[PDB]
Amino acid sequence: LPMPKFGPLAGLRVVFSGIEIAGPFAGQMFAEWGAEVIWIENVAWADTIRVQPNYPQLSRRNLHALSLNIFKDEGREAFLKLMETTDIFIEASKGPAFARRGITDEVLWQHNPKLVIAHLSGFGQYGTEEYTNLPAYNTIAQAFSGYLIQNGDVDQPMPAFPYTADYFSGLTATTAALAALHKVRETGKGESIDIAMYEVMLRMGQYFMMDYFNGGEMCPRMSKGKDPYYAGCGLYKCADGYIVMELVGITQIEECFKDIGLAHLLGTPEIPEGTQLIHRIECPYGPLVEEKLDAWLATHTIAEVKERFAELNIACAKVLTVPELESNPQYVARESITQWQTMDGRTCKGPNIMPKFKNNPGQIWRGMPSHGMDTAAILKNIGYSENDIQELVSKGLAKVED
Amino acid sequence: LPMPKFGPLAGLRVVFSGIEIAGPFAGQMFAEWGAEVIWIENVAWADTIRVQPNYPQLSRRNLHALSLNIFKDEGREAFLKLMETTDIFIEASKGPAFARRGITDEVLWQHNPKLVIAHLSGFGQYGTEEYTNLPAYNTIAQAFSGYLIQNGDVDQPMPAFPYTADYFSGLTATTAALAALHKVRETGKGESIDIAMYEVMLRMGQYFMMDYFNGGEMCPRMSKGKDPYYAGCGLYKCADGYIVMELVGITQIEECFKDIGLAHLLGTPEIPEGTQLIHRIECPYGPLVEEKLDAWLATHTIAEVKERFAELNIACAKVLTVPELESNPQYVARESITQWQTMDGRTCKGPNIMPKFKNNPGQIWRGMPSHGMDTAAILKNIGYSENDIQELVSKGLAKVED
């Protein structure tokens, strides 16, 4: 398809089937980096992402849109034809739904034995009858992986937000697909990847869970965003807003204690000279430290705290609100937030390409396409006649431009 | 170096410089999938991850350990010699710290012009003087990206946990390096990747922020893990634990309203017939729906709720605590949590390899290596004699096995 040549992934042919976040996020990341990415939508109903008023302009940019029933008759024939020249196929569905509907990996590899297939699901491509065919939900994936119980406040768990599991899972699919692609180039043989959302999130929540698995205890939840174990680490309230800080180091602790009214605790058997970290539960003065730190911070503006913490080399940062990002010096210098044109000629604002490739940078070349916008061109390219396409449309197996 | 041949990344030579999570997570992910990955540690002090009692056995498995001062004299020579046969180099540092110490991308490409270089920093390789040279911290990246301000409770922001920003950033680096690797196959030219942690997290926080950027409003924070906008979606407390649910669909809403005592609202102007989703802010009875739902769920055990929600086709799941994972049928069936031997010959439990590659699965072949364990072998492999190595050790430029 027509598009500029750019990025590390120029010339790569990616196709994805799925809606909302996880699957499409995986597929569209390839597009940020130069790939030719075809977004498959059902004929009767478009991707449900489209009901979101603004986000899709970001999450569907740089894409080509195909509307095809890939499971039925001529629509299935066309899909499998497309696979013959596709490098990577990404799909998000309810477990092994593709195989159940007749498109096994075997059938896919009949049409392209080099194909990299990435299956994104809530509970995996195989397992028990109870879980395997269940739908993928971000909150369910966090619930099932032990991620949800470790997020939130001491006595109130909460999911990570927004849709954190969908992004981790989609990103993993991208990563794994690029790894499999390397193997294809070395080897001439394709791959099937079973990305289960709960296994992705299981990995991401292991920092303390590894203690539980290995004779220790699981950590408690944070208290109001404070570190579960170490005093003076995490989220704090200043007079002026919120700050995050890391009270770490001999001098840092000595001088901070003096600031906050706790100089008398230095050189104590509980806080011996050379103390680098205050363990809030192991140290009897843990809670007292938090009391004095809260009180001192509540008295000072973020600008004041930042000035003092800079003298002491205590790492810290103001918690920025959404309205503060665009005008931030780093954001400005790096063009971290930019603008582009939608396909219907409106100005849209949002994050630039990330990350920044030096030699072959990504670019935004296309706004989000409309439902079935590129169907006619795609089907032509893979050998369908004008009549073939008309028949597909009239049968409800394809949709062309609005 | 000695290791089994397996995974999609068999034969690939990866080296990483960094400590703790972000950089090492990026590098080690290659090792999960079959790559030869060399973990660089300093000479006088080891990676600080090693102070963690259990996690490092997971986060450093399948790795080779090199202890070398890569910035000084003969240590720099040995490092740059290693680069000559290295496919990917991942480094996590304070902005352009490598360049400032004389190891620029240009110098790296002088030794290997094909080299893929991934730079992981908090704020980027370039920008302003105030931000560019700051240290990377998970909480700071969340604070600076607008991720922290949207997580937590209505009146209490909280960071995603644990170290969520480090994992996203690390994973992104793996993804981007693999993409750059693909391009090297065509051009024979390497690449430099500028991964700034805040830009990674900016992207992950866009779902609602895209409204703010484009004439709408930023979403509110969740209340006790409940959807910011839609009633009956998100986290709820039952009699004997927590569940997540999605109140979506005509019959689902109708029958749930009846269960909870709100039958009289069905067919009103506020909740017309055929309503599929309750917008909690736009619907005058949104808060009322929550009250009644909270009340009904509080009365019932999770077993009872799931039974009822199965009847009604309302998607839901128990929020599992960490002790409930190992014996779960899906975990059991998929071997999601497995066991392996540490190099001290102890049994270690933790997550299996993810995701599951069908043709070329990853495997655990090695426990976490000790400080400088493979220094001698690595240096011998790149042409150093026993005497060359001994001189490096005496000069404090390298450490060999314990």
PDB file of C-alpha atoms in Angstrom, chain A residues 128-244:
ATOM      1  CA  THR A 128      -8.918 -25.894  31.549  1.00  0.00           C
ATOM      2  CA  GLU A 129     -12.412 -25.682  30.034  1.00  0.00           C
ATOM      3  CA  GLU A 130     -13.378 -23.337  32.857  1.00  0.00           C
ATOM      4  CA  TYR A 131     -10.923 -20.517  32.056  1.00  0.00           C
ATOM      5  CA  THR A 132      -9.506 -20.952  28.573  1.00  0.00           C
ATOM      6  CA  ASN A 133     -12.476 -19.699  26.552  1.00  0.00           C
ATOM      7  CA  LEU A 134     -13.254 -16.706  28.796  1.00  0.00           C
ATOM      8  CA  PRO A 135     -13.092 -13.115  27.526  1.00  0.00           C
ATOM      9  CA  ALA A 136     -10.152 -10.779  28.094  1.00  0.00           C
ATOM     10  CA  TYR A 137     -10.726  -7.897  30.520  1.00  0.00           C
ATOM     11  CA  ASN A 138      -7.996  -5.709  31.974  1.00  0.00           C
ATOM     12  CA  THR A 139      -9.557  -5.787  35.485  1.00  0.00           C
ATOM     13  CA  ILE A 140      -9.967  -9.589  35.316  1.00  0.00           C
ATOM     14  CA  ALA A 141      -6.343 -10.028  34.231  1.00  0.00           C
ATOM     15  CA  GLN A 142      -5.177  -7.894  37.193  1.00  0.00           C
ATOM     16  CA  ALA A 143      -7.527  -9.812  39.529  1.00  0.00           C
ATOM     17  CA  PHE A 144      -6.323 -13.215  38.321  1.00  0.00           C
ATOM     18  CA  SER A 145      -2.573 -12.432  38.327  1.00  0.00           C
ATOM     19  CA  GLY A 146      -2.190 -11.053  41.846  1.00  0.00           C
ATOM     20  CA  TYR A 147      -1.608  -7.574  40.380  1.00  0.00           C
ATOM     21  CA  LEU A 148      -4.847  -6.046  41.661  1.00  0.00           C
ATOM     22  CA  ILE A 149      -4.442  -7.154  45.330  1.00  0.00           C
ATOM     23  CA  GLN A 150      -1.026  -5.510  45.554  1.00  0.00           C
ATOM     24  CA  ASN A 151      -2.120  -2.167  44.089  1.00  0.00           C
ATOM     25  CA  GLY A 152      -4.039   0.504  46.016  1.00  0.00           C
ATOM     26  CA  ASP A 153      -4.139   1.441  49.699  1.00  0.00           C
ATOM     27  CA  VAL A 154      -3.520  -0.669  52.860  1.00  0.00           C
ATOM     28  CA  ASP A 155      -7.219  -1.546  53.224  1.00  0.00           C
ATOM     29  CA  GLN A 156      -8.445  -0.817  49.687  1.00  0.00           C
ATOM     30  CA  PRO A 157      -7.061  -2.674  46.649  1.00  0.00           C
ATOM     31  CA  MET A 158      -7.447  -0.978  43.248  1.00  0.00           C
ATOM     32  CA  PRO A 159      -6.491  -1.871  39.678  1.00  0.00           C
ATOM     33  CA  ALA A 160      -3.662  -0.014  37.962  1.00  0.00           C
ATOM     34  CA  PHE A 161      -5.129   2.585  35.597  1.00  0.00           C
ATOM     35  CA  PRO A 162      -5.864   3.054  32.797  1.00  0.00           C
ATOM     36  CA  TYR A 163      -6.232  -0.463  31.327  1.00  0.00           C
ATOM     37  CA  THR A 164      -2.667  -1.219  32.446  1.00  0.00           C
ATOM     38  CA  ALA A 165      -2.976  -4.938  31.733  1.00  0.00           C
ATOM     39  CA  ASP A 166      -4.088  -4.313  28.139  1.00  0.00           C
ATOM     40  CA  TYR A 167      -0.972  -2.207  27.479  1.00  0.00           C
ATOM     41  CA  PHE A 168       1.493  -4.581  29.136  1.00  0.00           C
ATOM     42  CA  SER A 169      -0.110  -7.469  27.229  1.00  0.00           C
ATOM     43  CA  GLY A 170      -0.149  -5.677  23.869  1.00  0.00           C
ATOM     44  CA  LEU A 171       3.433  -4.501  24.311  1.00  0.00           C
ATOM     45  CA  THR A 172       4.508  -8.077  25.141  1.00  0.00           C
ATOM     46  CA  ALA A 173       2.813  -9.358  21.961  1.00  0.00           C
ATOM     47  CA  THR A 174       4.765  -6.768  19.920  1.00  0.00           C
ATOM     48  CA  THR A 175       8.036  -7.732  21.602  1.00  0.00           C
ATOM     49  CA  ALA A 176       7.465 -11.480  21.239  1.00  0.00           C
ATOM     50  CA  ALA A 177       6.404 -11.094  17.596  1.00  0.00           C
ATOM     51  CA  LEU A 178       9.612  -9.175  16.779  1.00  0.00           C
ATOM     52  CA  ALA A 179      11.638 -11.905  18.523  1.00  0.00           C
ATOM     53  CA  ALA A 180       9.832 -14.606  16.496  1.00  0.00           C
ATOM     54  CA  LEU A 181      10.437 -12.530  13.348  1.00  0.00           C
ATOM     55  CA  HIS A 182      14.200 -12.693  14.011  1.00  0.00           C
ATOM     56  CA  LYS A 183      13.892 -16.499  14.200  1.00  0.00           C
ATOM     57  CA  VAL A 184      12.013 -16.513  10.863  1.00  0.00           C
ATOM     58  CA  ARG A 185      14.811 -14.575   9.151  1.00  0.00           C
ATOM     59  CA  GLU A 186      17.430 -16.970  10.554  1.00  0.00           C
ATOM     60  CA  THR A 187      15.428 -20.083   9.908  1.00  0.00           C
ATOM     61  CA  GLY A 188      12.689 -19.712   7.249  1.00  0.00           C
ATOM     62  CA  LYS A 189      10.071 -21.118   9.627  1.00  0.00           C
ATOM     63  CA  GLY A 190       7.218 -19.315  11.393  1.00  0.00           C
ATOM     64  CA  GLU A 191       5.957 -19.313  14.960  1.00  0.00           C
ATOM     65  CA  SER A 192       2.834 -19.212  17.115  1.00  0.00           C
ATOM     66  CA  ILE A 193       2.844 -17.142  20.308  1.00  0.00           C
ATOM     67  CA  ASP A 194       0.409 -17.681  23.171  1.00  0.00           C
ATOM     68  CA  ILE A 195       0.237 -14.437  25.150  1.00  0.00           C
ATOM     69  CA  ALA A 196      -2.032 -14.871  28.184  1.00  0.00           C
ATOM     70  CA  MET A 197      -2.779 -11.581  29.900  1.00  0.00           C
ATOM     71  CA  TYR A 198      -2.639 -13.046  33.404  1.00  0.00           C
ATOM     72  CA  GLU A 199       0.847 -14.496  32.723  1.00  0.00           C
ATOM     73  CA  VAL A 200       2.073 -11.128  31.485  1.00  0.00           C
ATOM     74  CA  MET A 201       0.795  -9.462  34.677  1.00  0.00           C
ATOM     75  CA  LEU A 202       2.041 -12.321  36.852  1.00  0.00           C
ATOM     76  CA  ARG A 203       5.575 -11.462  35.719  1.00  0.00           C
ATOM     77  CA  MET A 204       5.077  -7.726  36.263  1.00  0.00           C
ATOM     78  CA  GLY A 205       4.020  -8.287  39.898  1.00  0.00           C
ATOM     79  CA  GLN A 206       6.902 -10.492  41.038  1.00  0.00           C
ATOM     80  CA  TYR A 207       9.138  -8.020  42.873  1.00  0.00           C
ATOM     81  CA  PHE A 208       7.721  -8.996  46.274  1.00  0.00           C
ATOM     82  CA  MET A 209       5.652 -12.039  45.305  1.00  0.00           C
ATOM     83  CA  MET A 210       8.950 -13.891  44.876  1.00  0.00           C
ATOM     84  CA  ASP A 211       9.302 -13.598  48.665  1.00  0.00           C
ATOM     85  CA  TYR A 212       5.992 -15.384  49.149  1.00  0.00           C
ATOM     86  CA  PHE A 213       6.906 -18.164  46.687  1.00  0.00           C
ATOM     87  CA  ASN A 214      10.220 -18.703  48.450  1.00  0.00           C
ATOM     88  CA  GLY A 215       9.562 -18.891  52.200  1.00  0.00           C
ATOM     89  CA  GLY A 216       9.049 -15.187  52.874  1.00  0.00           C
ATOM     90  CA  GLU A 217       5.966 -12.989  53.140  1.00  0.00           C
ATOM     91  CA  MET A 218       4.026 -10.965  50.601  1.00  0.00           C
ATOM     92  CA  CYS A 219       4.422  -7.200  51.055  1.00  0.00           C
ATOM     93  CA  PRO A 220       1.571  -5.067  52.392  1.00  0.00           C
ATOM     94  CA  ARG A 221      -0.150  -2.524  50.144  1.00  0.00           C
ATOM     95  CA  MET A 222       1.180   1.025  50.133  1.00  0.00           C
ATOM     96  CA  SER A 223      -0.259   3.517  52.583  1.00  0.00           C
ATOM     97  CA  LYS A 224      -1.344   6.559  50.577  1.00  0.00           C
ATOM     98  CA  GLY A 225       1.354   5.836  47.956  1.00  0.00           C
ATOM     99  CA  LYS A 226       4.190   5.384  50.461  1.00  0.00           C
ATOM    100  CA  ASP A 227       6.718   2.555  50.063  1.00  0.00           C
ATOM    101  CA  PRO A 228       5.530  -0.655  51.776  1.00  0.00           C
ATOM    102  CA  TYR A 229       8.867  -1.051  53.592  1.00  0.00           C
ATOM    103  CA  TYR A 230      11.047   2.084  53.570  1.00  0.00           C
ATOM    104  CA  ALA A 231      10.314   5.352  55.344  1.00  0.00           C
ATOM    105  CA  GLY A 232      10.697   8.581  53.381  1.00  0.00           C
ATOM    106  CA  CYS A 233      10.141   6.785  50.078  1.00  0.00           C
ATOM    107  CA  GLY A 234       7.144   7.360  47.803  1.00  0.00           C
ATOM    108  CA  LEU A 235       4.297   9.869  47.707  1.00  0.00           C
ATOM    109  CA  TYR A 236       4.001  12.834  50.096  1.00  0.00           C
ATOM    110  CA  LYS A 237       1.752  15.884  50.417  1.00  0.00           C
ATOM    111  CA  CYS A 238       3.363  19.340  50.431  1.00  0.00           C
ATOM    112  CA  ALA A 239       1.552  22.633  51.160  1.00  0.00           C
ATOM    113  CA  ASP A 240       1.469  23.163  47.433  1.00  0.00           C
ATOM    114  CA  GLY A 241       0.647  19.754  45.904  1.00  0.00           C
ATOM    115  CA  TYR A 242       2.166  16.252  45.830  1.00  0.00           C
ATOM    116  CA  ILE A 243       5.781  15.122  45.637  1.00  0.00           C
ATOM    117  CA  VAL A 244       7.548  11.782  45.320  1.00  0.00           C
TER     118      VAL A 244
END
